[PDB]
Amino acid sequence: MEMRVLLIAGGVSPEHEVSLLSAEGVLRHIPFPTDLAVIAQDGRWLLGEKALTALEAKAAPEGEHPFPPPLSWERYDVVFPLLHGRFGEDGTVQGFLELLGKPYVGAGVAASALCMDKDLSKRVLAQAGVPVVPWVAVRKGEPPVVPFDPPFFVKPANTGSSVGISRVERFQDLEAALALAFRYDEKAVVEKALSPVRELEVGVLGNVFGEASPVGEVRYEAPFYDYETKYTPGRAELLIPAPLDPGTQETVQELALKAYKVLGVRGMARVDFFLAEGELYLNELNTIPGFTPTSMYPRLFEAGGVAYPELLRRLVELALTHHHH
Amino acid sequence: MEMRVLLIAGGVSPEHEVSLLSAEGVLRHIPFPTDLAVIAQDGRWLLGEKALTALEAKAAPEGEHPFPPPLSWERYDVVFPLLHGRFGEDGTVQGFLELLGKPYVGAGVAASALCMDKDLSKRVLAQAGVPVVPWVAVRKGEPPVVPFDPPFFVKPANTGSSVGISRVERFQDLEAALALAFRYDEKAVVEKALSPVRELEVGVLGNVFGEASPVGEVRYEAPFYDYETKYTPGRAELLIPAPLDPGTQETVQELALKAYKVLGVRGMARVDFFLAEGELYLNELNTIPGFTPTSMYPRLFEAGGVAYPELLRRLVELALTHHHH
Numbered sequence: 301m302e303m304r305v306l307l308i309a310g311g312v313s314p315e316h317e318v319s320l321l322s323a324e325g326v327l328r329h330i331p332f333p334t335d336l337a338v339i340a341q342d343g344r345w346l347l348g349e350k351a352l353t354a355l356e357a358k359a360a361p362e363g364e365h366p367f368p369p370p371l372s373w374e375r376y377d378v379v380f381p382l383l384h385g386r387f388g389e390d391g392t393v394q395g396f397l398e399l400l401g402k403p404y405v406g407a408g409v410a411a412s413a414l415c416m417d418k419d420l421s422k423r424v425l426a427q428a429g430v431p432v433v434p435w436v437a438v439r440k441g442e443p444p445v446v447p448f449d450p451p452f453f454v455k456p457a458n459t460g461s462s463v464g465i466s467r468v469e470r471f472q473d474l475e476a477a478l479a480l481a482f483r484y485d486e487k488a489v490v491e492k493a494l495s496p497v498r499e500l501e502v503g504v505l506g507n508v509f510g511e512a513s514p515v516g517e518v519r520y521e522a523p524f525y526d527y528e529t530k531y532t533p534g535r536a537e538l539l540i541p542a543p544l545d546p547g548t549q550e551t552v553q554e555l556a557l558k559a560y561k562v563l564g565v566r567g568m569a570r571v572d573f574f575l576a577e578g579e580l581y582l583n584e585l586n587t588i589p590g591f592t593p594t595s596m597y598p599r600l601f602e603a604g605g606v607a608y609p610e611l612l613r614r615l616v617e618l619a620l621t622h623h624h625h
Numbered sequence: 626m627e628m629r630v631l632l633i634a635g636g637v638s639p640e641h642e643v644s645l646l647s648a649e650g651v652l653r654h655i656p657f658p659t660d661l662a663v664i665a666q667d668g669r670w671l672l673g674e675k676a677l678t679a680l681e682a683k684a685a686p687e688g689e690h691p692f693p694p695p696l697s698w699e700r701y702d703v704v705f706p707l708l709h710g711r712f713g714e715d716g717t718v719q720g721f722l723e724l725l726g727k728p729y730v731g732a733g734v735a736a737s738a739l740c741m742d743k744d745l746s747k748r749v750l751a752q753a754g755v756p757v758v759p760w761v762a763v764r765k766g767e768p769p770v771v772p773f774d775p776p777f778f779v780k781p782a783n784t785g786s787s788v789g790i791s792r793v794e795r796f797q798d799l800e801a802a803l804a805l806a807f808r809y810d811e812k813a814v815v816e817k818a819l820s821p822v823r824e825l826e827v828g829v830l831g832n833v834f835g836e837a838s839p840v841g842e843v844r845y846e847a848p849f850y851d852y853e854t855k856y857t858p859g860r861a862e863l864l865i866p867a868p869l870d871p872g873t874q875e876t877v878q879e880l881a882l883k884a885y886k887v888l889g890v891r892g893m894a895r896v897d898f899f900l901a902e903g904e905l906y907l908n909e910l911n912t913i914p915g916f917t918p919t920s921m922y923p924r925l926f927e928a929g930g931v932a933y934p935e936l937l938r939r940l941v942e943l944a945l946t947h948h949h950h
């Protein structure tokens with residue numbers, strides 16, 4: 301069976317650089333012939349050799365081709381969008397690939413848009429009976445109304461890689477944290493800070509009915525799991541399988557697969573959890589998790605017997621299983 | 626008039642013909658110079674005179690240009706996506722227009738995908754405290770588990786114009802109703818049927834400060850408000866305002882504006898309600914309501930003092946005042 305993959309990375313979101321790092325990880329292990337297309341930070345695309353040059357520079361601030369690119373789509377059998385964050389993970393790029401008729405890796409338009417919004421996903425999961433941290437949404441320009449005591453975490457609703465996230469100890473500091481969050485999104489979420497908190501992560505592989513990886517725990521000495529901790533090698537420790545009680549591992553996997561099914565995710569997702577005072581909370585689902593050298597999604601399925609090339613092979617294959625339907 | 630609008634109608638959804646009818650209604654009343662582009666049922670586009678020709682035919686089975694079309698997008702200030710249903714109303718075309726950077730009428734990607742999914746939209750509305758009909762989601766290839774007794778209403782999760790919807794009386798008939806619904810979507814909803822029921826519909830207009838139209842009511846002698854009843858002229862009784870006592874009409878508008886904000890809609894929406902034994906239930910929210918001769922949304926706002934050309938003009942202005950934000 302003929303298979304040629306087009307890999308798209310970069311993007312206009314703050315995670316532009318993280319996306320190129322993920323692209324390098326995928327290219328080093330994907331078992332299919334794969335071409336790279338880069339979306340530069342200005343929204344213009346780089347194709348062919350100019351895309352590989354931008355990958356070597358680990359940043360593409362400016363691109364060549366305005367959207368839509370003159371890409372020979374017919375040459376590829378599956379498109380692998382690796383665009384973390386806004387305009388890549390939130391269903392907008394997915395909508396373009398749907399109208400293009402090309403099979404593509406990962407969640408569709410709906411699952412991507414709803415998993416990217418920290419307020420909407422928490423609305424759906426809370427109704428479904430999934431435990432979530434207390435939270436409220438704040439629209440840019442509206443006065444916040446936080447019906448619980450600090451500490452808070454303030455986040456852009458569409459964020460990734462902990463960009464624009466603040467831990468707020470005093471109400472005096474809510475205004476500055478919201479102003480930081482509103483640089484990246486018109487909507488912010490304010491969550492009750494769990495402290496102390498343990499952070500659990502589990503990978504999911506599959507279309508709607510997912511297969512769960514072992515549960516992993518992230519540990520670090522920074523105040524929280526911030527940008528520098530996430531992508532500086534050595535700062536983040538992954539303990540697989542997570543040191544959890546008899547049965548706690550299964551509950552984490554059951555919640556992840558439940559949220560996966562309810563939201564209708566296809567392909568993959570990394571589901572993050574909080575463990576505080578013995579209580580589990582689902583933090584978020586990431587439909588396009590990182591494949592950077594310090595990323596956890598490949599390591600989680602590595603520990604579950606799915607090697608890195610086999611994981612990428614199954615992702616491309618799941619894209620065709622849905623498209624062939 | 627310097628403003629130039631691009632109207633997109635047709636589509637690959639079962640509502641292809643309905644979309645063309647809506648295009649004729651909008652083209653007749655829109656006060657800006659408007660070009661039409663038609664998405665044929667095979668996904669290929671028709672531009673210029675061939676799109677006007679398909680409009681007179683009220684059906685476009687085959688197109689000419691494969692997506693993405695060679696449309697001079699820079700000619701148009703606002704794009705009006707008038708595509709009901711799959712690949713038009715569910716966020717796919719919205720994501721494409723987002724990447725084009727074009728201002729467009731109606732809800733964004735997330736709110737479009739959320740409002741089209743009758744399961745996920747009900748979960749969000751229920752979590753916000755909005756009354757909904759008891760329901761359950763049934764996935765294709767998965768046995769149904771319905772915690773309430775028939776009569777049922779079985780629908781494809783992402784449908785419009787009552788396509789694939791069945792009224793069910795006995796559990797022995799559920800599997801055939803689910804089999805019809807699975808011809809249009811991998812997911813279906815089974816709702817508790819309300820009989821007798823009155824059907825109330827309200828239009829909403831705006832981005833941040835949505836304003837409600839007067840409440841209207843649909844009456845019919847057919848079993849339910851099905852496809853033939855919706856679009857055969859004279860078949861449905863459109864009562865504006867609805868013969869209700871004022872307190873019920875004000876409550877309907879209050880709920881519609883609450884659901885509008887809860888679901889994150891901008892531009893427009895028609896909110897459908899059920900009235901059964903004195904209780905109001907929100908049925909669904911349509912981000913691209915029909916503009917056919919038998920359609921409720923334009924009429925509701927003419928009754929509220931907003932003429933047909935003024936309605937479309939404000940839809941276009943709202944698309945511009947959102948973009949500039």
Ligand SMILES: Nc1ncnc2c1ncn2[C@@H]1O[C@H](COP(=O)(O)OP(=O)(O)OP(=O)(O)O)[C@@H](O)[C@H]1O
Pocket residue numbers: 433453455459460461462463465491492493494495497499524525526572574583584586
């Ligand atoms: N409610 C909370 N209580 C305690 N810590 C939190 C809370 N919310 C966020 N954090 C800390 O901030 C980090 C980032 O939060 P979150 O996962 O929401 O951001 P993200 O950018 O979506 O992450 P990712 O890069 O995995 O997508 C978490 O790993 C956690 O360490």
Ligand SMILES: Nc1ncnc2c1ncn2[C@@H]1O[C@H](COP(=O)(O)OP(=O)(O)OP(=O)(O)O)[C@@H](O)[C@H]1O
Pocket residue numbers: 758778780784785786787788790816817818819820822824849850851897899908909911
């Ligand atoms: N729970 C219910 N109880 C009673 N009648 C129902 C119920 N669900 C659906 N119906 C009937 O079926 C019709 C279509 O249902 P629904 O509005 O969900 O379909 P739709 O295709 O989304 O409609 P639209 O064309 O407005 O998008 C309704 O107008 C109503 O008459």
Ligand SMILES: [Cs+]
Pocket residue numbers: 415416417584585586587
């Ligand atoms: Cs996310």
Ligand SMILES: [Cs+]
Pocket residue numbers: 435436
């Ligand atoms: Cs809440």
Ligand SMILES: [Cs+]
Pocket residue numbers: 740741742909910911912
């Ligand atoms: Cs809908």
Ligand SMILES: [Cs+]
Pocket residue numbers: 759760761
């Ligand atoms: Cs339910």
Ligand SMILES: [Mg+2]
Pocket residue numbers: 459460461584585586
């Ligand atoms: Mg995330």
Ligand SMILES: [Mg+2]
Pocket residue numbers: 572583584
């Ligand atoms: Mg996280």
Ligand SMILES: [Mg+2]
Pocket residue numbers: 784785786909910911
């Ligand atoms: Mg509808």
Ligand SMILES: [Mg+2]
Pocket residue numbers: 897908909
């Ligand atoms: Mg309806």
